Design a protein around this ligand. Structure first.
Ligand code: CLA
Ligand code: A86
Lengths: 162, 220, 168, 176, 179, 155, 170, 176, 172, 169, 169
């Protein structure tokens, strides 16, 4: 596992702990799945904090009860003032995505390929190493976004401005 | 045509414990403690290790190794339980906190001392009694047909636990087996009388013997 | 086979559109829709009976919105009295039924549950019950559609249509 | 066979630890532990619904302790509010069931009773209900540990939490 | 039957420990009695479970004698508080079953009572052996339970509802017997 | 053997050809001797029971301590068994039922249950002509007790 | 089969009219009437048991005629105390049953339902229950006839004959 | 060897019972019991001297029972005044010492240590100190039992018996 | 003779990681670290016993800070009460020890001192004491950790926890 | 070899009577007396130091005779202030020592013990320590005789002298 | 051997004047003097610690001169406070040591005493302890001379050099 998506020019196959020192492809493909899974969430979460921390809101009335989007605070306090009928819909739809329409159903080219032959914005017009270059970009962009969103969550409860 | 146990009462050798009653043929004399005592004929209907599953529910013919397994485990508990019926009344009791409650371990009636001590006292006793019965099944499952009854791998012979040495002679070892079995059968009768007198008197046996081995206050 | 599964005596095949000769490849889904529309309409019309008989659940549907189970109307607008998180829980659970557990794209109509749990192995007895699931579904489709138009045209629910003398 | 049971559609043969190709000798008991843990937790989940619906019998479980059946709590402390002489009678009978009547050293889970007494003679129908026992048993293992942990974290039983409407863990007073 | 081993169940096997079967013909007589005694003692055991739970009918068993259903004791003397004009109706109907409908001279015990798909013995012969053994085993356990229920009332004077309300489950320390 | 036709010295009228019309089990002579002997044996212990109850050998004690019925309260007439409690009359007929099926089974038509004549706990076996002589005296005294009860129960 | 169905134990093939040998082809018609008369009379005996146990429907049978369900007598005058628009609904729905649905011209007896939904697989078990329907149908034919005759020759219903202690005719 | 280790000058080989030739195989444990009894009784004599010189640890043995170290009797009722949770600590520690660390089934008493950590390499000198340990153990065995019967027959500890001048026997004495 | 020096009773050879079969070449350092961590923790559990028994040095540790020996806490915060001009004097002298006098680069653990100045010529007697130093060193590593963890889990030092009767695990 | 054990450096072998070259068979008892007189006198000079430094046993030596340990003199009359039931306990215990445990008939000297319980394992440093026991025995035999002579001449103990300053004759 | 007894690791054979080959026969005296000066200096360093902790003998050194043990200064002026009849006693007893008992003309160094009375049989352990005696003698020689010049350049003993905080250079 020394020349793959994670092998980078600054640190090629870092691996300090005792994770994959064997020929276990099935253990690597599970761990590569979750790292791409944590990265794709934390990429939207870094933007999803800095949109709310900048005060940007949807144009108003998150409910018919008379609660605007600007009334909902930013950060960890957002989950407390979201109305609970809509808090179920956030968990039900994300669960609808994560159970049904997010998987490698038809069989993709790699780990994390969720194009089931349904949505495809190209992926044929590439140089076959630009495919591996674009895949290694979203791994490392997903890598920095995990440490990014962990910094914004540890320093909100601390109160330190960033 | 005939029963498998009616043919064992047809041979029906002479007995020693019931010398007027003609013990059945399934007491071959080859077992330890064979004194020809089976008036109800349980040895003619031998039992198998039913706890291992449905494949072990049926008993082999002429094999009383699981009746002897149940005889030894009843008698080994009954020996420890005679002392447990006695020793709180003789050597005092244990003290309690305000957590367990004071006078929790102090009930000298041994039967309602079960409901007086905390449940964690009995849960940990039961789980330690459980742990050696897990040890017994892992010995029975491993040895199978070559398992001698009462073996928890404690003592003299093969790779058993022997922290005391205990290297008996190979014929002094068979009188220790007979001393154990005769104390197994005796303490089973003794722990029944301890349990039945503790209900009939309501006190422990030292408060019952000690009140009967003393002179009355109007007589002194 | 599913081709003879819906034909009974007093109508037989009965295609005024003739859609078994024309486009016969679409019959395998139209049977799956008629079986699906039948099973929903049977459960909708035995539920209309128990709604208007007042067999309610004696509690609160939503105490945060102060909805007792008896507060919901027993007619056509009773589905609208269910709140936002109430209708979201129905859409979330039956997405797990219609796509995962008993997937509604499976055109067999056969999700391994049988008729009260048993495989009817007699093929003449099994073909009789599937004529019954279709015929009682067909009569409930006209039943549940003759109950909505009997409420939106008279205003009353079924309990009030019967406790008025307003049948004839 | 046994090794294809428990592998249903959305995950297939799901073993992220890889102990099927690593330890195939220990599977024949580990299925028996999974099936037993499932069957225990299915009766445990059904029990918590019956307890918290206040379905009690009548009278005293222990008239010497003056302890009614309704006096027993409907949460984690329910089985430990039974007196020790009563708890010993349950465990003695359940050990009689789990060693003699339904001996749990029998690893295929087959105890002479079928599914409501009947053998399922169709082999693909038998494998479907063998998977339905495993899947409902695996779902009830999460359900009973999700009812036990969520009682000791919120401090209320399943009836008191629902009475209170304490369903949202984001706007209450808890951690995070 | 002897060959399929119907009474011999897995704890004890062929439990004839005193050697009473010396003939295959005397087994069919004894099994005809054991199965008949077990069928009677099972309904006797369900009786004492219903009677001692206080579950009675509403009204009068004998309005001519003013005997309500709740006036009958739930113990071993409740059958004989019934008037003998009413007890003759029980013996006449039960005797008509014993001679005509389920003739007890039929030593097989089979009277054609088949509850079809709950015993499909031709497809499932293992269910035949399970239900044949469980008729005997439940009949044997209820035979000893009804000797349990009968003698526990004799030696204590209280029926099962009264001796359980008092917690009287030990023959030691009480004023009854020499123990 | 106690089933011979030579005991009671003969002879009487009908021979009962109606017995073999459609109830042919009851037309067997060997059962009619078993019935005549058993009606005889029950009648002989019933006239002694008539003598003991009418001489007021009442008993020492209570018959039912719960109902408060002493033995002196039950009548001496023909309503004696029907005035004791039905829970007590059941125990009488139950113990006869063990006798009627298990101990002295009435299906054994000979009547010989291996008891001898006068000696309990070891049978007094009669051997020859006096064995056959005591057999007919059992029947002849059984017949006089059968006609003696209907003479003593009509008034 | 079909002809070996009314033969249980005691009387066997009992007919003191000779009509199994006089008309051998007019038997399937007569067995179909015997089975239909049995099924009607069996439901009528259980009906008189439910009526005279005062199990009523807790409402109004005809609120325009203003009679409750606990206003119809539980004896022979039950159908007579029903409005004729309600009898017209009974006679027309069972016209659909007796002609269009499970008919009476189907002399075989089995329409589609079987014994509690299923078919009895063992033919000796199946022929046993076919005699049971015949015997219980034959006994309820005499049973419901003696419930109506004992009512009209007393003037009381089945509930009133029992509660008033008037059972023995002597 | 071990059979030459108990014999000293004025008596030599001393067995009135004659079990050195009668039971020659039971000697190897009976030496280990004599050595164990001697070692236990030597610490019991020195402890009896220390308790009656009023050397106390200056504190509280059981502050829950308000039991100081100086409140404990310095005689034969010393450990009868220790609370039962304190005797449990003594038995649990010497279960670890008498079964695992220095196990008494080791019938030579040669666990890990020497004489003050020294292995005496001279065999005539090592046999001399092995004779001393047995002889001082035999003297302290008589010394602890005569101490114990002199207390229960006087009702006094050894401090009180030397306070009242009660060295002379009111019963009947036997001393060197 | 270093492979067999930690091997004692019941456990025998104990390596759940299997590092004696994975890294046979790094054992000489890893033994020298276990011996050093044992010697440091053995002088530390004895240290908490001395500090919680209030054995102090009867004077001023820092008269410039007006700090007595009895003013320092007897728990985990005792090293923090020492001023940094005195903490520099500790590190300056043990730099002379751990680099020059008894250098910790010497992986034997063996310096000019023996066991109380004595070299043990009997090899089984010497390996018995080397096993004791490792075993008492291992038991003091788990002892000095269970003393620092149980202090911050109660806030009190070992003197104040024992005085309050806080031995039984009530809150945990 | 006991024959060169007494001879030290500054005088060598010393025999003004010439009883080594006189009777040779009496030497092993005369060595046994010189060693025994040394060991008794060395424990006596240390005993005069402890008594005159007022180190006492903090109690009553004889509470029947009302004798504290402080009341015993520290000179030559200290042994005579002991009661006669105390001098016999010294007499009968040291009979067990001198006849049985460390029997004075053993003219070799080594009873059971060595130099703090051990043999010295070395014939030239054990002979050096055997020289020390004799030489420190010889200087203490003169030391205890000079302690007792000036005790009775001056009439004071060794604490009353050194309180008067009696250091010149 | 004696020629390898002074070497240690951080200096080795430290002869900056090269006198080991310039005067090879004079090494036996100079080793004996370096060991003699070290043994005096290590007793002198430990002595300065005991003097300046005010551990005193609790009495009178000279009642004729009315001089208690506490009347003697701890630092450099401590041997000057001893009377000349006491310095005659020091030079008389240590004339018996330095000439007769442990004579300083004996250049070998080892007298009859060992290291705490024991010979060291291991030659690698004996030579190690011989190196410690020289090195601790070397460290105390410059150590005691650094305590004398910390008083004759300050005028203040080692006790109140620490009390007044006057160790700042
Ligand atoms: C760091 C402290 C220290 C150390 C480790 C030593 C070590 C030693 N001393 Mg020294 N000593 C010291 C300080 C120290 N000394 C001080 C401060 C003084 C003044 C009080 C002395 C006064 C002293 C004397 C007078 C003698 C020693 C001797 C010895 C040696 C004994 C070795 C042996 O067994 O000889 C071999 C053994 C024999 C020849 C037989 C005897 C057994 C040993 C090297 C002895 C020696 O000879 O030194 C080389 C000796 O006689 N030391
Ligand atoms: C390094 C080296 O060289 O090795 C060393 C070490 C080694 C090997 C160990 C060796 C040894 C042998 C040794 C050390 C032997 C020592 C033996 C010892 C210490 C024996 C004590 C007896 C005391 C008794 C019996 C008390 C009686 C009882 C008494 C006194 C009383 O009851 C009265 C009293 O109590 C009360 C009642 C009230 C109090 O108010 C007053 C008193 C106190 C009066 C060597 C050879 O010597 C040298």
């Amino acid at each position: 596992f020394e020349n793959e998506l994670g092998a980078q020019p600054p640190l090629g196959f870092f691996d300090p702990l005792g994770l994959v020192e064997d020929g276990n492809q099935a253990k690597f493909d599970r761990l590569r799945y979750v790292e791409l899974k944590h990265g794709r969430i934390s990429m939207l979460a870094v933007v999803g904090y800095l949109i709310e921390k900048a005060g940007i809101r949807l144009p108003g009335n998150i409910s018919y009860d008379g609660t605007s989007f600007a009334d909902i605070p930013d950060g960890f306090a957002a989950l407390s003032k979201i109305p609970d009928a809509g808090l179920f819909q956030l968990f039900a739809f994300i669960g609808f995505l994560e159970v049904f329409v997010m998987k490698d159903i038809t069989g993709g080219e790699f780990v994390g390929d969720f194009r089931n032959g349904f949505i495809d914005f190209g992926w044929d017009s590439f140089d076959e190493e630009t495919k591996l270059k674009k895949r290694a970009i979203e791994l490392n962009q997903g890598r920095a976004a995990m440490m990014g969103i962990l910094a914004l969550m540890v320093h909100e409860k601390l109160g330190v401005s960033l | 045509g005939a029963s498998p146990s009616a043919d064992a009462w047809a041979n029906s050798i002479e007995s020693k414990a019931l010398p007027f009653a003609r013990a059945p043929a399934t007491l071959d004399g080859t077992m330890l403690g064979d004194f020809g005592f089976d008036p109800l004929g349980f040895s003619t209907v031998p039992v198998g290790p039913w706890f291992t599953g449905i494949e072990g529910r049926n008993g082999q013919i002429g094999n009383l190794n699981w009746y002897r397994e149940a005889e030894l485990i009843h008698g080994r508990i009954a020996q420890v339980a005679v002392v447990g019926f006695i020793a709180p009344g003789l050597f005092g009791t244990l003290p309690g906190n305000e957590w367990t409650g004071v006078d929790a371990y102090s009930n000298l009636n041994p039967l309602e001392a079960f409901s007086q001590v905390p449940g964690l006292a009995i849960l940990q006793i039961f789980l330690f009694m459980s742990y050696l019965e897990v040890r017994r099944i892992n010995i029975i499952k491993e040895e199978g047909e070559n398992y001698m009854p009462g073996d928890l791998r404690i003592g003299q012979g093969e790779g058993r636990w022997n922290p005391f040495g205990l290297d008996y002679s190979p014929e002094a070892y068979e009188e220790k087996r007979l001393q154990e079995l005769k104390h197994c059968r005796l303490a089973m009768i003794g722990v029944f009388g301890l349990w039945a007198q503790a209900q009939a008197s309501g006190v422990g046996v030292t408060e019952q013997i000690g009140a009967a081995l003393t002179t009355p206050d109007y007589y002194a | 086979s599913e081709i003879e599964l819906g034909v009974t005596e007093p109508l037989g095949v009965y295609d005024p559109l003739g859609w078994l000769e024309s486009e016969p490849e679409a019959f395998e889904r139209r049977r799956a829709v008629e079986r699906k529309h039948g099973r929903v309409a049977m459960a909708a019309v035995v539920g209309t009976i128990v709604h208007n008989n007042h067999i309610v659940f004696d509690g609160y549907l939503s105490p945060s919105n102060n909805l007792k189970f008896s507060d919901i109307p027993t007619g056509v607008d009773g589905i609208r009295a269910i709140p936002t998180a109430g209708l979201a829980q129905i859409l979330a659970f039956f997405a797990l039924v219609e796509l995962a557990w008993m997937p509604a794209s499976k055109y067999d109509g056969d999700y391994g549950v049988g008729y009260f749990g048993t495989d009817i192995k007699d093929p003449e007895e099994k073909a009789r019950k599937l004529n019954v699931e279709l015929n009682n579904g067909r009569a409930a489709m006209m039943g549940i559609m003759g109950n909505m138009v009997a409420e939106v045209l008279t205003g009353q629910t079924m309990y009030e249509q019967y406790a008025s003398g307003h049948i004839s | 066979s046994e090794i294809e049971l428990g592998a249903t559609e959305p995950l297939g043969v799901f073993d992220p630890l890889g102990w099927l190709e690593t330890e195939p000798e220990a599977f024949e008991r580990r299925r028996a532990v999974e099936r037993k843990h499932g069957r225990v937790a299915m009766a445990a989940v059904v029990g918590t619904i019956v307890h918290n619906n206040h379905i009690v019998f009548d009278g005293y479980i222990s008239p010497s302790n003056n302890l009614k059946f309704s006096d027993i709590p409907t949460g984690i402390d329910g089985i430990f509010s039974v007196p020790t002489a009563g708890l010993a009678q349950i465990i003695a009978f359940l050990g009689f069931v789990e060693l003699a009547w339904l001996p749990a050293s029998q690893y295929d889970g087959d105890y002479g009773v079928g599914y409501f007494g009947n053998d399922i003679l169709d082999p693909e129908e038998k494998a479907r209900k063998l998977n339905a026992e495993l899947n409902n048993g695996r779902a009830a293992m999460m359900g009973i540990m999700g009812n036990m942990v969520a009682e000791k974290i919120t401090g209320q039983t399943m009836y008191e939490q629902y009475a209170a409407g304490h369903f949202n863990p984001f706007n209450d007073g808890e951690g995070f | 039957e002897l060959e399929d081993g119907i009474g011999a169940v897995a704890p004890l096997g062929y439990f004839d420990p005193l050697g009473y079967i010396k003939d295959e013909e005397t087994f069919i007589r004894y099994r005809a009695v054991e199965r008949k005694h077990g069928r009677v003692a099972m309904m006797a055991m369900l009786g004492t479970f219903v009677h001692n739970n206080g579950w009675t009918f509403d009204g009068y068993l004998s309005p001519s004698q003013g005997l309500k259903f709740s006036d009958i004791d739930s113990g071993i003397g409740g059958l004989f508080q019934v008037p003998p004009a009413g007890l003759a109706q029980i013996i006449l109907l039960c005797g008509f079953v014993e001679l005509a409908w389920w003739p007890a001279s039929n030593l097989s015990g089979d009277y054609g009572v088949r509850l079809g798909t709950l015993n499909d013995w031709e497809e499932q012969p293992a269910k035949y052996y399970r239900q044949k053994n469980a008729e005997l085993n439940n009949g044997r356990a209820a035979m000893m339970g009804i000797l349990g229920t009968f003698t526990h009332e004799v030696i204590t004077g209280q029926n099962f509802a009264e001796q359980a309300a008092a917690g009287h489950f030990s023959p030691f320390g009480d004023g009854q017997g020499f123990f | 053997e106690p089933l011979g036709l030579y005991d009671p010295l003969g002879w009487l009228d009908p021979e009962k050809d109606p017995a073999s019309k459609f109830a042919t089990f009851h037309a067997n002579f060997e059962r009619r001797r078993a019935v005549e002997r058993k009606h005889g044996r029950i009648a002989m212990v019933a006239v002694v029971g008539m003598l003991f109850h009418n001489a007021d050998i009442e008993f020492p004690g209570y018959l039912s301590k719960e109902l408060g019925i002493r033995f002196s309260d039950v009548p001496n007439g023909m309503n004696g068994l029907f005035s004791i409690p039905l829970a007590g009359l059941t125990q009488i007929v139950f113990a006869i039922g063990v006798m009627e099926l298990a101990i002295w089974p009435a299906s054994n038509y000979s009547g010989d249950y291996g008891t001898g004549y006068g000696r309990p706990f070891v049978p007094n076996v009669l051997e020859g002509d006096e064995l056959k002589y005591k057999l007919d005296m059992e029947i002849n005294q059984g017949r006089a007790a059968m006609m003696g009860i209907m003479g003593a129960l009509v008034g």
